[PDB]
Amino acid sequence: FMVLNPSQQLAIAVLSLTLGTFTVLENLLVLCVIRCRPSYHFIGSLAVADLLGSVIFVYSFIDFHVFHRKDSRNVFLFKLGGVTASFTASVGSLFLTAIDRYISIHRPLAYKRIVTRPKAVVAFCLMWTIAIVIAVLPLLDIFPHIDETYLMFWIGVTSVLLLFIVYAYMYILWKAHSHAVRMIQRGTARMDIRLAKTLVLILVVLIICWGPLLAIMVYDVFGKMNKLIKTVFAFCSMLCLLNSTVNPIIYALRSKDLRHAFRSM
Ligand SMILES: COC(=O)[C@@](C)(NC(=O)c1cc(C)n(-c2cccc(C(F)(F)F)c2)n1)c1cccs1
């Protein structure tokens, strides 16, 4: 149901116009400097999956709580299928840049023969054909026409794909550390300190943007609900427009190719 406040419904309209117009105007310019090599496809399909997920959401959320509107059982679930298929096509893309950066230090001899363009152009096809086959899937407390046996399906997939990202960046910081002993001290503390101040920022902008909201969404299935948790889920849902703005500050800015190609044109 739709009860937040009459008082806390006049600041989100100003907040979503400043955390909503930059994420459009940054994920567009990033796709205006792409150049294309088979690990720059995976960074491209999460700069197009965060320009669509920030228009359907900013149009539905400003419609449902501030100035009011009603719907039906087939009109409403169609707009809800455009924020469910665009928030798991922005997490499955974070699962492909952490499986591409894992077959480059674990088997560094084979990264120009395993990961080729015939297996990196079909790979993002088999995510957009599973994320719209589990978001049209309703063929059948806070989400109106949704039964509780379906919120134990979406959370149980988005959680196990965030436990292959906090393992695929804690094996690059162990393999580049034992290696750091030999080709520095014996070989001729230099290499594992330039990968320990960017690789800690990727894991502290992910656990504070998929950890509060994936906890409240468990408190429905895992027991009773109440009144004051319905008013704080409407501010714990604007974190998704915070983890759409910082993504081209961590993946596009932190490079030597995308920052020099920009400089020349
Ligand atoms: C109560 O809903 C809403 O009024 C809105 C504003 N939507 C949200 O508030 C919202 C906020 C978030 C973070 N999600 C989300 C994201 C992924 C998956 C799921 C689900 F449904 F599969 F569990 C939900 N939905 C929408 C109305 C019409 C389209 S959206």
Author numbering: 108 to 141, 148 to 253, 266 to 313, 335 to 411
Sentences from the paper on this structure:
To understand the SAR of ‘1350 at atomic resolution, and to template future optimization, we determined the cryo-EM structure of the ‘1350-CB1R-Gi1 complex to a nominal resolution of 3.3 Å. Consistent with earlier structures of human CB1R in its activated state, the ligand occupies the orthosteric pocket formed by transmembrane helices (TMs) 2–3 and 5–7 and is capped by ECL 2. The experimental structure of ‘1350 superposes well on the docking-predicted pose of the R-enantiomer, which was the enantiomer with the better docking score to the receptor (-43 DOCK3.7 score versus -38 DOCK3.7 score for the S-enantiomer). In optical rotation studies, ‘1350 was shown to be the (-) enantiomer, together identifying ‘1350 as the R/(-) enantiomer. The predicted and experimental structures superposed with an all-atom RMSD of 0.78 Å. Despite the local resolution limit that prevents unambiguously modelling all rotamers, the density suggests that major interactions with CB1R predicted by the docking are likely preserved in the experimental structure, including the key hydrogen-bond between the amide carbonyl of the ligand and S3837.39. The trifluoromethyl group is complemented by van der Waals and quadrupole interactions with residues W2795.43 and T1973.33, as anticipated by the docked structure, and consistent with the improvement in affinity by -1.7 kcal/mol (‘51486 Ki = 731 nM vs. ‘60154 Ki = 44 nM, 17-fold increased Ki from CF3 addition only) on its replacement of the original fluorine. Key learnings from the SAR include the importance of bulky and hydrophobic groups in the R1 position, which is modeled to pack against W2795.43 and T1973.33, with a meta-substituted CF3 being most favorable. Further, methylation of the chiral center (R4 position, ‘1350, ‘4936, ‘5806) meaningfully improved affinity (approximately 6-fold in ‘4936, 15-fold in ‘5806, and 50-fold in ‘1350). This addition is predicted to increase van der Waals interactions between the ligands and transmembrane helix 2.
